Amino acid sequence: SVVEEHGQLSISNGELVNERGEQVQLKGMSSHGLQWYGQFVNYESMKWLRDDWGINVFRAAMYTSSGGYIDDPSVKEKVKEAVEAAIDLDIYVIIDWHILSDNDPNIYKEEAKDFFDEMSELYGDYPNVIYEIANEPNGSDVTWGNQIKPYAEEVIPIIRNNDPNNIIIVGTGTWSQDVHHAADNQLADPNVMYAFHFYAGTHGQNLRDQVDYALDQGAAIFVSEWGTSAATGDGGVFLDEAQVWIDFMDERNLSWANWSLTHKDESSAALMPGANPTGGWTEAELSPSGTFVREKIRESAS
Numbered sequence: 089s090v091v092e093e094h095g096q097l098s099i100s101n102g103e104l105v106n107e108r109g110e111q112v113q114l115k116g117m118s119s120h121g122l123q124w125y126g127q128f129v130n131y132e133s134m135k136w137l138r139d140d141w142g143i144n145v146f147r148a149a150m151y152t153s154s155g156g157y158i159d160d161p162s163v164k165e166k167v168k169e170a171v172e173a174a175i176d177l178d179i180y181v182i183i184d185w186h187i188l189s190d191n192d193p194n195i196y197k198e199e200a201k202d203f204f205d206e207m208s209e210l211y212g213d214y215p216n217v218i219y220e221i222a223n224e225p226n227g228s229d230v231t232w233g234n235q236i237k238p239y240a241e242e243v244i245p246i247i248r249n250n251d252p253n254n255i256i257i258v259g260t261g262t263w264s265q266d267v268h269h270a271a272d273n274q275l276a277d278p279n280v281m282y283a284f285h286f287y288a289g290t291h292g293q294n295l296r297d298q299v300d301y302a303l304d305q306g307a308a309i310f311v312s313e314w315g316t317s318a319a320t321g322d323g324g325v326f327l328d329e330a331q332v333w334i335d336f337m338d339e340r341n342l343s344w345a346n347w348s349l350t351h352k353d354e355s356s357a358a359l360m361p362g363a364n365p366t367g368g369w370t371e372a373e374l375s376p377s378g379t380f381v382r383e384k385i386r387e388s389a390s
């Protein structure tokens with residue numbers, strides 16, 4: 089029903105919109121690294137998230153480094169399984185080339201172009217798909233102008249050869265925080281969005297105002313990853329400031345995906361250790377973070 093209602097997504101003056109120009113706000117979950125916690129990504133768990141949480145988007149976080157796709161490309165099958173599940177379930181799906189320790193997106197540019205050529209040929213005709221070409225560029229010598237924009241300028245045409253219209257989300261500097269630099273030197277492709285990521289126990293008003301700057305320049309922003317914890321993961325969850333951010337995103341209709349769907353023992357994890365991989369979770373199988381995120385997604389779901 090989600091993709092059935094909205095169909096093809098596009099950007100209109102910085103806003104994510106459906107095929108009739110109506111605002112669309114996607115809320116869902118991100119997987120943790122598919123090379124570590126791939127058992128939580130399957131048709132049953134995505135159905136349970138769709139039906140019980142009300143998600144309308146699922147993000148497949150394909151790490152490149154850290155035992156991910158570069159060393160073992162069999163993780164692509166997990167990405168495929170997620171995409172095909174999303175298509176069956178009628179929800180949107182984000183294919184995320186999850187760089188992090190490989191902080192400059194150009195480190196694996198050739199591989200990224202090959203990977204996105206393959207994904208876009210297989211799935212380009214479905215409106216469900218969203219590409220995220222560089223999770224979190226980071227480092228003082230990784231900038232929008234020198235490193236990230238030019239990367240996007242090479243990868244985007246590769247996807248566009250096969251898929252002329254699906255949304256492409258492009259990471260920004262400082263772990264996808266530097267949306268204002270990107271907004272002052274935007275890509276030309278009309279269906280692009282810039283990533284903005286945050287952690288409720290670490291980031292506040294200063295980054296909120298930076299996001300407002302970017303939006304004021306006409307740039308579209310997709311909060312493709314955010315955590316309820318501190319970036320450090322100490323002190324537990326910070327749901328007070330997480331709720332300020334929730335309202336911030338709602339005021340501006342920003343789409344988001346929470347990090348992350350795993351049973352790992354870290355505050356941002358949505359599930360408790362031992363939680364069922366195929367969903368159907370009791371309330372005891374959800375962490376404090378998961379309980380809160382589920383509530384945020386349910387209360388806006390139809």
Ligand SMILES: CO[C@@H]1O[C@H](CO)[C@@H](O[C@@H]2O[C@H](CO)[C@@H](S[C@H]3O[C@H](CO)[C@@H](S[C@@H]4O[C@H](CO)[C@@H](O)[C@H](O)[C@H]4O)[C@H](O)[C@H]3O)[C@H](O)[C@H]2O)[C@H](O)[C@H]1O
Binds near residue numbers: 124154224263
């Ligand atoms: C300005 O300071 C920086 O801010 C950034 C946030 O804007 C910080 O980036 C964030 O760093 C977090 C800590 O690494 C990660 S949490 C996330 O990803 C990490 C790394 O993959 C993993 S830890 C990882 O887990 C594996 C599986 O259990 C394990 O095998 C491996 O040994 C272990 O390293 C964690 O579980 C995930 O939640 C955020 O993704 C990132 O945005 C930056 O750290 C900080 O310097």
Ligand SMILES: [Ca+2]
Binds near residue numbers: 160
């Ligand atoms: Ca492996």
Ligand SMILES: [Ca+2]
Binds near residue numbers: 205206209
């Ligand atoms: Ca090709």
Ligand SMILES: [Ca+2]
Binds near residue numbers: 212214215251252254
């Ligand atoms: Ca398409």
Ligand SMILES: [Ca+2]
Binds near residue numbers: 242
């Ligand atoms: Ca080049």
